[PDB]
Design a binder for this molecule. Sequence first.
Ligand SMILES: [Br-]
Ligand SMILES: [Br-]
Ligand SMILES: [Br-]
Ligand SMILES: [Br-]
Ligand SMILES: [Br-]
Ligand SMILES: [Br-]
Ligand SMILES: [Br-]
Ligand code: NA
Length: 129
Amino acid sequence: KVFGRCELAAAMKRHGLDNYRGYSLGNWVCAAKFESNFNTQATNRNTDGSTDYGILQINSRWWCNDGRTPGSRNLCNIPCSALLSSDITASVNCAKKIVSDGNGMNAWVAWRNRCKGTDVQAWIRGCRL
Ligand SMILES: [Br-]
Ligand SMILES: [Br-]
Ligand SMILES: [Br-]
Ligand SMILES: [Br-]
Ligand SMILES: [Br-]
Ligand SMILES: [Br-]
Ligand SMILES: [Br-]
Ligand code: NA
């Protein structure tokens, strides 16, 4: 599913992602735009054999299990395919544990390079919240 700008913002807020661990709602919406272009069915392969899945591109080396990553962990205890659904519940819950491992939202390379230090509130401008 291809989400709308204001549509995805409302969905993230309903799941308690807004200001989770100190990161405002505009930060998560900016990260989803450049990681996925608001597309829940996005997948991308990595160098070491791992793969990123979903609207936030969660990595299979530690967090989910796709059955093709030798010597990896499944710390979120979930199949990677669950992060591609039209419902964003599984991506949000695992993202909360990822952001709690000690490095914050710096685990997402796209956020650090394209959202960190910008006008992130403009991504929710005009929306009815
Ligand atoms: Br847009
Ligand atoms: Br914001
Ligand atoms: Br595996
Ligand atoms: Br394969
Ligand atoms: Br494990
Ligand atoms: Br949803
Ligand atoms: Br932090
Ligand atoms: Na894994």
